[PDB]
């Protein structure tokens, strides 16, 4: 969950 949350945060 956290890895994905961060991946997305960065992209946006």
Task: Explain what the structure shows.
- Helix content is about 85%, strand content about 0%.
- With about 10 residues, it is an all-alpha fold.
- The protein contains one helix and no strands.
- The chain has one helix at about 1-10.
- The longest helix has 10 residues, at about 1-10.
- It is classed as de novo protein.
Topology (elements, then pairings):
Layout: H1 2-11
Short structural summary:
With 12 residues, the chain is mainly alpha-helical. The chain has one helix at residues 2-11. It is elongated and about 15 Å long.
Rounded to the nearest angstrom, the distance between the terminal CA atoms is 17 Å
Number of strands: 0
Strand and helix order: H
Q: How much of the residues is beta strand, in percent?
A: under 5%
Supply the number of helical segments: 1
Percent of residues in helices comes to over 70%
Overall, the morphology is elongated
Helix/strand-derived category reads mainly alpha
Comma- or semicolon-separated keywords:
12 residues, de novo protein
């Amino acid at each position: 969950a956290a890895a994905l949350a961060a991946a997305l945060a960065q992209a946006l």
